[PDB]
Design a protein around this ligand. Structure first.
Ligand code: HEM
Ligand code: HEM
Lengths: 248, 248
């Protein structure tokens, strides 16, 4: 259902050059997880029914940065600002989504297709649209399904985004990585989720909710058995996520 | 631009009976001002661009009651609940708007036309849409004009709603009545606004903003000179306000 806009040849060239600079920067700084969190929090506020929120550059706003959910994303914005200044032709909207695609690529994940053209919009969405780690399967469906408009398959595959990074007790209050290799994008999140608790590793109630749901669980099983299948469904869901409200 | 829905004869009959019970109740309890505030806060969250908020019964929600702007409106809701229980066929949306129309009538104001049929909606709007007493003419136009979709004339006439009632230092922090007769609906708000400060009487910065605006000021002048003209424009604006997002 997407009709992507035309951007100038100079715009396309800056996308390709920023993509490369982003790989080197994100790899050296070890910030892929944070960058994937910035792209997701930017996109995941989309509400399909009113067409507000979504990946439109507004996360750099002090007001959206203020959102509790956005704990420490002010660091992400700060880290990218010097690099962004090198590409003044690109929208922040595009640049943040491109950082998210790069974060997944440089940690070894699938190549999520990217289309430029998102415009930077003046108003951040209301606070409170991002999911709550303490809630379960109904809440995930309200958030990904009723608000963003993603499928049940997308919810499980996108949860696998937790295969990189960690929680921090000074940010959310949860603490620690989901996997033994938190800078490597793989299907380990699902493997660890299934095998139960292990010292040093995190499972949120929202992650565990995938285990008891009649539709989520067979997807958890599929992805733990077949990383190629995880990667295919992940790239599909991330692409849709990064394009919410864009080019419809 | 309004196409009002059909309601059953029994619905219409309960409107007429609740109208009368509301006059006697609101007059005896001396709560017209609070009731007009409940109706306005219920309606004034309408955002035309997304069609959210507006007079749809959601102010009774603990979550909307929580809004700081709604300081003490939990009292209003409480006062009406026994009476509402006598009219289970009416929507809360209709009942609150009818209390607002009655509040204006029983204090001596114009007869604002009323049409039933508003449905009670499940989700309260986001917090922060109601105007801020410390801001000025640009802010009033953002709020009444860009969000609700009312005219410059409606802003000035609706501000005359402050001809009844008072601020309270434990609610907003402002304190006192705008007029010497705070249970009498008349053009005194504009008379007092013009004559400057007087001991015992309140003017918010938002009220004073009407004095310095090239479009608001001649309306202030007109209404201070001609109560009949105020009443005509007030009834027009209150009607539109009470119908935001309804029967379009
Ligand atoms: C299913 C609903 C989700 C919930 C309840 C949730 C909750 C959380 C929480 C509480 C944290 C810890 C923040 C901190 O303390 O630093 C976190 C981190 C993270 N989230 Fe999720 N999240 C969800 C979905 C997603 C999605 C869809 C993605 C991306 C595809 C994602 C990517 C990440 C990443 C990469 C981190 C680590 C950030 C870092 O290392 O600093 N999450 N999430
Ligand atoms: C122009 C923007 C407005 C601002 C900034 C504003 C602000 C305020 C504030 C700060 C209070 C005091 C609340 C308290 O401390 O108890 C108040 C009271 C009140 N407002 Fe306004 N208001 C505005 C517009 C309106 C409108 C459009 C109406 C209805 C037509 C209205 C009706 C009232 C009434 C009747 C009271 C007295 C409530 C009572 O006596 O308890 N106001 N307003």
């Amino acid at each position: 259902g997407k009709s992507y806009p035309t951007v100038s040849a100079d715009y396309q060239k800056a996308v390709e050059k920023a993509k490369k600079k982003l790989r080197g920067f994100i790899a050296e700084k070890r910030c892929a997880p944070l960058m994937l969190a910035l792209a997701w929090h930017s996109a995941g506020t989309f509400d399909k029914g009113t067409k507000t929120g979504g990946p439109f550059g507004t996360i750099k706003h002090p007001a959206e940065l203020a959102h509790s959910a956005n704990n420490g994303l002010d660091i992400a914005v700060r880290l990218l600002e010097p690099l962004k200044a090198e590409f003044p032709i690109l929208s922040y909207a595009d640049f943040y989504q491109l950082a998210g695609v790069v974060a997944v690529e440089v940690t070894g994940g699938p190549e999520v297709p990217f289309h430029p053209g998102r415009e930077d919009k003046p108003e951040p969405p209301p606070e409170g649209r991002l999911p709550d780690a303490t809630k379960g399967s109904d809440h995930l469906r309200d958030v990904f399904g009723k608000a963003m408009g993603l499928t049940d398959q997308d919810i499980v595959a996108l949860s696998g985004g937790h295969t990189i990074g960690a929680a921090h007790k000074e940010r959310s209050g949860f603490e620690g990585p989901w996997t033994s290799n938190p800078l490597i994008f793989d299907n380990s999140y699902f493997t660890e989720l299934l095998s139960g608790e292990k010292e040093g590793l995190l499972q949120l109630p929202s992650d565990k909710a995938l285990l008891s749901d009649p539709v989520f669980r067979p997807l958890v099983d599929k992805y733990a058995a077949d990383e190629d299948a995880f990667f295919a469904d992940y790239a599909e869901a991330h692409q849709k996520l990064s394009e919410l409200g864009f080019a419809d």
